[PDB]
């Protein structure tokens, strides 16, 4: 009470000062033509007298198009618009961790104010060719399919593209839930601070998302940034730049950070609304020209930093939905063109039975084997080549073109590895169990074993290896490579377990 | 082209374009106040109901509009600036826009005099000693060599008062916005 | 939740009481402080 009194009466300066303003013309639909600001700078946070920010774009000789950060009822024609004096900025700290933060800095979750220290400009320039260095660290997701065919690098951007309702947000949350075991460990290089920018979603999906992360105890890497549907179109526009600025703070301090841009097409459609209300000419699908420049800034804010610049990395993974699987639409071609890694879900495998539904050969990671551990590189290259062989031989021998022993070998190993890559929702596993199970799948011992029985093989095999083989998995994950004694030991343990599986 | 003489306030639009042309011409030939008082006399003329009824109505055959305005010019003996100005507005058909170009060129000449359009809201009917000391401190406050033209308006809604807008600079000690600043302070 | 709703009740009654009193408060030291503020911005301008 009394502390509230004294903070209210000491905190506000009430330091009046002469200040540039300008009256307001047409306040249309969140856009306001403001006459008068002859010294406003382009893309600047400006302030409507009812207490609400707007961002000044589209500086014209008549007037400035300020697009508002919120509701439109609270603005009339003829009121003042005060210049704040600086570009729109995001308050970033490490005390911002584990707290849902509305798109500017405003933590709307009911857990007090944010204890920020480091304000940061949000429209910053990304690093050049010298401050960047290449991908080195293996960004693991816990998904067997991602970490064994399209592995991520700490230092990298990699799409999650699909159609609606396929498992893309679920892949992003598997990626989040994996990294708990690296945060609570010892190495700072393993530890994770991630930023989940939910663009244009609904508030109950973000609420149940925070429920899943709190129940999975995720709230020390995580920073959830919600610009939901009821938020204004510039809050949905500006939210992934805010998450990028928080990720750039962690990166330039030297902590391995990532950002999941969930539903990045909602940023594209909110910026389409903004351009068509500020009367810019429409381009293709009524999206304007610089949507590629928009996502190109947003996604080239991330690669590994130099060893003299802290060594912190950023992993941008944006989630994008197509419509009817049309990859040739404007926003998917732009966002595939800017990124390099991309994970393709076609959906017919989701209804066919593999989970997560990576339908695959469209998906590629350009950094490839450089972003794997040494064991997963030693095991899972022949798996990718075998899956390529399997897909093409099944595609022409759909009807039984020619079946020698080689073709039934290819279909057998392909179907068995297809049921290897199935994995339940919200259950990420570490890298050493993945090396163990893809060793049990690729290096023999599963080729003639009745493909419906692969899932019980998975369950009993993980139970076996977590039961009496924890120190050997410690040897595998800490030694890096899977050594030759560990190789023959995995051979012996999978043979013993094949006996105990036909027991 | 010819070097267009820069006006002090860029009024934009159609009427601002006509007014910048007229200002640059009248500043080349250096008869600016003469052209301003003649445009004020024209704006007094074209508010007559017979002349404005003849002009705003179509199907009065634009050549006859040009002839009528040239005969009205040759009757009251305008200068050769505003004569060609009214003839150009008649030829283009933007005689609907002539009180707005008179307003725009009047604004440009009022800035050429050096006036500053001061706005003050005391939010209560203020007295003459307050107005005297306010004009004194505000004339000292604006700049050197410029004259202010102040207006005052009132409303009981905004408590306290004394907002002052002088030359885009808007100082605001209103009690309502003080409660609004303390309001943003108290909700956090 | 007790301190939250008492805080909301407190802050709204404070704002309403401020409107109630300062809406009916005029003694011209408001205008005197305001002309002093224009004088101070004149001295610093």
């Amino acid at each position: 009470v009394s502390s509230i009194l004294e903070e209210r009466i000491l905190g506000a300066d009430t330091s009046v000062d002469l200040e540039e303003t300008g009256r307001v013309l047409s306040i249309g639909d969140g856009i306001a033509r403001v006459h008068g600001l002859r010294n406003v700078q382009a893309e600047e946070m400006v302030e409507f007298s009812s207490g609400l920010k707007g961002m000044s774009l589209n500086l014209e000789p008549d007037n400035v198009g300020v697009v508002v950060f919120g509701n439109d009822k609270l603005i009339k024609e003829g009121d003042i618009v005060k210049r704040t004096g600086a570009i729109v900025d995001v308050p970033v700290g490490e005390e911002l961790l584990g707290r849902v933060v509305d798109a500017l800095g405003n933590a709307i979750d009911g857990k007090g104010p944010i204890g920020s220290k480091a304000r940061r400009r949000v429209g910053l320039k990304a690093p050049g060719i010298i401050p960047r260095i290449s991908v080195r660290e293996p960004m693991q997701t816990g998904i067997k399919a991602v970490d064994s065919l399209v592995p991520i690098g700490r230092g990298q951007r990699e799409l999650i593209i699909g159609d609606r309702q396929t498992g893309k947000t679920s892949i992003a949350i598997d990626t989040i839930i994996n990294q708990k075991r690296f945060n609570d460990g010892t190495d700072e290089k393993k530890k994770l601070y991630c930023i989940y920018v939910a663009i244009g979603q609904k508030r109950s999906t973000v609420a149940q998302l925070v429920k899943r992360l709190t129940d999975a105890d995720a709230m020390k890497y995580t920073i959830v940034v919600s610009a939901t549907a009821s938020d204004a179109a510039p809050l949905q526009y500006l939210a992934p730049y805010s998450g990028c600025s928080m990720g750039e703070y962690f990166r330039d301090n030297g902590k391995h950070a990532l950002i999941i841009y969930d539903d990045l097409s909602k940023q594209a459609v909110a910026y389409r609304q903004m351009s068509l209300l500020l009367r810019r000419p429409p381009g293709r699908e009524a999206y304007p020209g610089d949507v590629f420049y928009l996502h190109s800034r947003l996604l080239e804010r991330a690669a590994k930093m130099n060893d003299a610049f802290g060594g912190g990395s950023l992993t941008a993974l944006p989630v994008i939905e197509t419509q009817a699987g049309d990859v040739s639409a404007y926003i998917p071609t732009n966002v595939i063109s800017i990124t390099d890694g991309q994970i393709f879900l076609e959906t017919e495998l989701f209804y066919k039975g593999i989970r997560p539904a990576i339908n695959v050969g469209l998906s590629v990671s350009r950094v490839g084997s450089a972003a794997q551990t040494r064991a997963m590189k030693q095991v899972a290259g022949t798996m990718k080549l075998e899956l390529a062989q399997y897909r093409e031989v099944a595609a022409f021998a759909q009807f039984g073109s020619d079946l020698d022993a080689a073709t039934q070998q290819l279909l057998s190993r392909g179907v068995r590895l297809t049921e290897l890559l199935k994995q339940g929702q919200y259950s990420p596993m570490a890298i050493e169990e993945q090396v163990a199970v893809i060793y049990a799948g690729v290096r023999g011992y599963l080729d003639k074993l009745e493909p419906s029985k692969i899932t019980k093989f998975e369950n009993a095999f993980l139970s076996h290896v977590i039961s009496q083989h924890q120190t050997l998995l410690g040897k595998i994950r800490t030694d890096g490579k899977i050594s030759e004694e560990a190789d023959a030991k995995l051979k012996e343990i999978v043979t013993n377990f094949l006996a105990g599986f036909e027991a | 082209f010819a070097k267009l003489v820069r006006p002090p306030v860029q009024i934009y639009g159609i009427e601002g374009r006509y007014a910048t042309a007229l200002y640059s011409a009248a500043s080349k030939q250096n008869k600016l106040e003469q052209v301003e008082k003649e445009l004020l006399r024209v704006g007094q003329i074209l508010k007559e109901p017979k002349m404005a009824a003849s002009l705003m109505n179509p199907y009065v055959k634009r050549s006859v509009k040009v002839k009528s305005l040239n005969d009205m010019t040759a009757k009251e003996k305008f200068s050769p600036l505003t004569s060609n100005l009214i003839n150009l507005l008649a030829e283009n058909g933007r005689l609907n826009n002539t009180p707005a170009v008179i307003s725009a060129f009047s604004t440009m000449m009022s800035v050429h005099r050096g006036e500053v359009p001061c706005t003050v809201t005391t939010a209560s009917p203020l007295d003459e000693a307050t107005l005297t000391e306010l004009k004194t401190v505000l004339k000292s406050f604006l700049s050197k060599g410029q004259v202010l033209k102040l207006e005052v308006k009132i409303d009981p809604s905004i408590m306290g008062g004394m907002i002052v807008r002088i030359g885009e600079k808007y100082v605001d000690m209103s009690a309502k916005t003080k409660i609004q600043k303390l309001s943003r302070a108290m909700r956090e | 939740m007790m301190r939250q709703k008492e805080q909301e009740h407190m802050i709204n009654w404070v704002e309403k009481h401020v409107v109630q009193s300062i809406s009916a408060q005029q003694e011209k030291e408001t205008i005197a402080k305001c002309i002093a503020d224009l004088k101070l911005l004149a001295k610093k301008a």
Partner: peptide
């Protein structure tokens, strides 16, 4: 210090 000291006074009166 015009307004906020009056607000202080009303903080006392609600207190």
């Amino acid at each position: 210090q015009k307004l906020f000291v009056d607000k202080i006074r009303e903080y006392r009166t609600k207190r």
